[PDB]
Design a protein around this ligand. Structure first.
Ligand SMILES: [N-]=[N+]=Nc1ccc(NCCCCN[C@H]2C[C@](O)(CO)[C@@H](O)[C@H](O)[C@H]2O)c([N+](=O)[O-])c1
Ligand SMILES: [Ca+2]
Ligand SMILES: [Ca+2]
Lengths: 87, 854
């Protein structure tokens, strides 16, 4: 049997295991280990937003209860259900 | 300010009469033959030796080491005013015993000691002792004065063009108090004056009369918008408090003299009603006063965030542009404010039909950003037969009246206006019902209220307020009630916000005028300050004097109300306001727009940094306010409250503490290159929270600063909880994880608390739905336990990080929590700063847990 590899921050400041990617704690100084959560202060969250322009938002706006992406993917565990508005 | 509009003591005929009585042999004497020791009080007749007027002293010992003195006429022609609704309860009494008696003296013991009261008969005098230590004397300088009610400037009196008919003649009361050992007194807000009160001998007394002073100036004793007749005395050895329960115009003289301070209160009407709060510690005084007039209302979390206001935001589009400007510039903000131009011609509870045509939709767009709105509602009602509020109040006879029985009419923002009689409980109930969502059309649960001009301000009235001979509920004159008029407005508004929700939502009401007890109803601010460096400086002593008398939810307009601040002053005011309880930027109608993103980037960035620090400290602010609410302890504190034996702190007012954990010295000088920070306490350490550099006390440290500096130090032995994930408003943050900042004492210990609940309801009280955690560090173990087991709360909040200052590098870090296997945590350690960061404990904040550093 063979195994798996680790993750390297895009700024090169560290290497961490992949189970610390999107684990809701900021481990990279550039925020690159938490693209899907609100854990890093300098991170970004990518709205795919099919049917309109794709957009980046601050990590602090992921699950803040406010609809930021027109596709609503920034709110997946906040109690706010966002509707698609990319029309 | 044009000072000629406002009376000096000489122009106030009762102040002139009283203040002309100088220290000497008092003509009052106690008729010990009449002495009766009743079931909860002692009564004894007093007599004026010349006039032969008979008074009655009601002397009471109270539980929690307090004494109450009340003096009224024996047979008055008409009853005198006794202040209602300020005391939260009938104070529980303690039994008096006669423990000594001669021809001229009766010694009384409170319960079984150690407090004793010596009543001297000739001249009348009271001494208060703990065993054989004299704490305080009453009438020691013979300044007691009680003008009895005679047969209906001593009578009819004019000031400028206003004539006080004065149908009851002279009725003023006055009384002096001697504080042996005390050289520093504090309190009796509100004055634009220093924290440590000055002697008045060569000048004016301190005045307590809620008044609207246009462009008020600094360092003078003129009465401003609110009056709390509470004075605190501090020395190395003891703390005392005096609570003069009177609602009429009151002047306070302070004199120094082995060191001793004498205090004399002078009031226009009512009875003598004073509480002596014997300490001995200042926190004992806080508790004693809190048991009388209550504690600070637990603010809803959002109201501890940042408030964006001005006179005035133009229209719904403007409000929404401001809202979007905060998000587009990554600046947090919880509330946007609507001043008087949002209504229809200053008819309150209305909306301008052009500029605010759809308030529900505006409020809905703010709710979708999880932000709130505040609307101003003043207590003057436009005289207008088409104004439904005016018609209903007129038809039901709920207006303040003149002596001839017609409704009083003055001038204010809408022109000619009438004044609801908020001393009338039927009026207050009407007012509270007016805030229901059916009555206040356009309002919604995220709309809150600002009560302004509630002294009441009357533009064409004497001293810009209501005539002394206007008539209120039950025939009382306006001179009797003046200083609680604003409080009643604040109270009726706050109850209305509660009732409109079915009793569930906590209110938020900012009020300009206030009295003892106002802390129970929301926040206050220091009124119309000015965009100047000295007004920035004075916000500390003003809010500190309000903190000492129970009003913890205090602040000043960030940037100054009048005039335009230079960007550097605005930055320093944001940093100052970011560490004061009530945090709102506000501005005059003719000032330039100063939303914080309109400045150059260097200033924007420093303002954003100050806003982030405030939002990160909300768990800390919230806990301090829960302690204020439960215990009566002030949130913002003078250094001498935490260091009562360090006499070099007794006057400090360019520095303050938040609770016991954070010491703040904001930069308050243009172009400053450093600040002199006094770090107090023997064997005490302090941590610079920006550099983590540890400093030993006591010392005065010179700290260099830049535009972005906010000099803040964490005390060793404390644990401060933070939300390090700053979002656009507090509602977005209130389920986020906590980072704990542990500042180790020299003995390697630290302690702290944390309060949590849903953030806005009374469920913490009615269902015990909250968490009160205790965090404690000793040996090498950080432990979380419950500081109140009655509190349970469903919450996703967890502990994502622990930052320990002053620690060595461990070999291993081990977490244990009930219900989970023993876990090991990774960590980072800086040998230069001795800062240890524990990565992701991942434990719920509702769970007991412990972390061990091996
Ligand atoms: N006497 N005569 N009549 C006068 C009296 C005063 C006056 N200007 C005084 C400005 C102080 C207002 N301050 C309070 C009211 C707000 O300004 C708006 O509700 C609020 O923003 C603020 O916070 C409050 O403290 C004028 N005038 O404008 O000519 C005429
Ligand atoms: Ca991570
Ligand atoms: Ca969002």
């Amino acid at each position: 049997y063979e195994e798996s590899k680790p993750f390297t921050c895009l700024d090169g400041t560290a290497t961490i295991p992949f189970d610390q990617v999107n684990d809701d704690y900021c481990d990279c100084k550039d925020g690159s280990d938490e693209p899907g959560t609100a854990a890093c202060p300098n991170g970004s969250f990518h709205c795919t937003n099919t049917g309109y322009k794709p957009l980046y938002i601050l990590s602090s706006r992921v699950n803040d209860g406010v609809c930021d992406c027109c596709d609503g993917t920034d709110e997946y565990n906040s109690g706010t259900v966002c509707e698609n508005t990319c029309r | 300010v044009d000072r000629s509009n406002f009376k000096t003591c000489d122009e106030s005929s009762f102040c002139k009469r009283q203040r002309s009585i100088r220290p000497g042999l008092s003509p009052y004497r106690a008729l010990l033959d009449t002495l009766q020791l009743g079931p909860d009080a002692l009564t004894v007749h007093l007599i004026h030796e010349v006039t032969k007027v008979l008074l009655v002293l009601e002397l009471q010992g109270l539980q929690k080491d307090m004494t109450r003195i009340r003096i009224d006429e024996l047979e008055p022609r008409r009853p005198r005013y006794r202040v209602p609704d300020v005391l939260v309860a009938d104070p529980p009494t303690a039994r008096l015993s006669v423990s000594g008696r001669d021809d001229n003296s009766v010694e009384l013991t409170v319960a079984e000691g150690p407090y004793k009261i010596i009543l001297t008969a000739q001249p009348f005098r009271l001494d208060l002792l703990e065993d054989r230590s004299l704490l305080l004397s009453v009438n020691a300088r013979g300044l007691m004065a009680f003008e009895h009610q005679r047969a209906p400037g001593a009578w009819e009196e004019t000031f400028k063009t206003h004539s006080d008919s004065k149908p009851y003649g002279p009725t003023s009361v006055g009384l002096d108090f001697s504080l042996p050992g005390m050289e520093h007194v504090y309190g009796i807000p509100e004055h634009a004056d220093s924290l440590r009160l000055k002697v008045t001998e060569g000048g004016e007394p301190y005045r307590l009369y809620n008044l609207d002073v246009f462009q008020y100036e600094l360092n003078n004793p003129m009465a401003l918008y609110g009056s709390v007749p509470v004075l605190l005395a501090h020395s190395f050895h003891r703390d005392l408090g005096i609570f003069w329960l009177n609602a009429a115009e009151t002047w306070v003289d302070i004199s120094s003299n082995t060191p001793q301070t004498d205090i004399r209160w002078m009031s226009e009407s009512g009875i003598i009603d004073v509480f002596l709060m014997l300490g001995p510690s200042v926190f004992d005084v806080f508790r004693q006063y809190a048991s009388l007039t209550g504690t600070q209302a637990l603010p809803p979390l959002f109201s501890l965030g940042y408030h964006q206001s001005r006179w005035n935001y133009r229209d719904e589009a403007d409000v929404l542009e401001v809202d979007q400007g905060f998000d587009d510039h990554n600046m947090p903000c919880d509330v946007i404010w609507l001043d008087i131009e949002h209504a229809d011609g200053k008819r309150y509870f209305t909306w301008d039909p052009t500029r605010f045509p759809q308030p529900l939709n505006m409020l809905e767009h703010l709710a979708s950003k999880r932000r709130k709105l505040v609307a101003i509602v003043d207590p003057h009602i436009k005289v207008d037969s088409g104004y439904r509020v005016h018609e209903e109040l007129r038809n039901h006879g709920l207006y303040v009246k003149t002596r001839d029985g017609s409704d009083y009419e003055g001038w204010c923002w809408p022109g000619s206006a009438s004044y609801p009689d908020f001393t009338n409980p039927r009026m207050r109930a009407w007012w509270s019902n007016m805030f229901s969502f059916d009555n206040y059309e356009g309002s919604a649960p995220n709309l809150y209220v600002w009560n302004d001009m509630n002294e009441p301000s009357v533009f064409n009235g004497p001293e810009v307020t209501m005539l002394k001979d206007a008539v209120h509920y039950g025939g009382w004159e306006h001179r009797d009630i003046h200083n609680i008029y604003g409080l009643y407005v604040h109270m009726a508004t706050a109850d209305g916000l509660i009732q409109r929700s079915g009793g569930i939502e906590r209110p938020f009401v900012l009020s300009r005028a206030f009295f003892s007890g106002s802390q129970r109803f929301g926040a206050v601010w220091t009124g119309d300050n000015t965009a100047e460096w000295d007004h920035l400086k004075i916000s500390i002593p003003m809010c500190l004097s309000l903190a000492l008398v129970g009003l913890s939810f205090c602040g000043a307009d960030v940037g100054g109300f009048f005039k335009n601040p230079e960007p550097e002053l605005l930055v320093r005011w944001y940093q100052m306001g970011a560490y004061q309880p009530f945090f709102r930027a506000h501005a005059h109608l003719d000032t330039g727009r100063r939303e914080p993103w309109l400045l150059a980037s260097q200033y924007q960035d420093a303002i954003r940094d100050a806003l982030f620090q405030r939002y990160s400290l909300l768990p800390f602010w919230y806990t301090l306010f829960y302690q204020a609410h439960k215990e009566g302890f002030p949130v913002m504190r003078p250094l001498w409250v935490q260091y009562p034996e360090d006499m070099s702190t007794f006057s400090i007012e360019d520095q303050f503490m938040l609770g016991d954990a954070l010491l703040i010295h904001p930069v308050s000088d243009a172009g400053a290159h450093g600040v002199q920070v006094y770090l107090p306490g023997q064997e005490e350490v302090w941590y610079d929270i920006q550099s983590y550099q540890k400093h030993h006390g006591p010392q005065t440290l010179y700290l260099p600063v830049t535009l972005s500096s906010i000099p803040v130090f964490q005390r060793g032995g404390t644990i401060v909880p933070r939300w390090m994930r700053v979002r656009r408003s507090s509602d977005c943050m209130k389920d986020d994880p906590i980072t704990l900042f542990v500042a180790l004492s020299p003995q390697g210990t630290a302690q702290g608390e944390l309060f949590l609940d849903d953030g806005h309801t009374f469920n913490y009280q009615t269902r015990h739905e909250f968490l009160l955690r205790r965090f404690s560090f000793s040996g090498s173990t950080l432990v979380s336990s419950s500081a109140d087991p009655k509190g349970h709360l469903e919450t996703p909040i967890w502990i994502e990080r622990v930052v320990i200052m002053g620690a060595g590098k461990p070999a291993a870090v081990v977490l244990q929590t009930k219900g989970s296997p023993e876990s090991r945590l990774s960590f980072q350690h800086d040998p230069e700063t001795s800062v240890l960061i524990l990565r992701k404990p991942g434990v719920s904040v509702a769970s007991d847990w412990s972390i061990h550093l091996r």
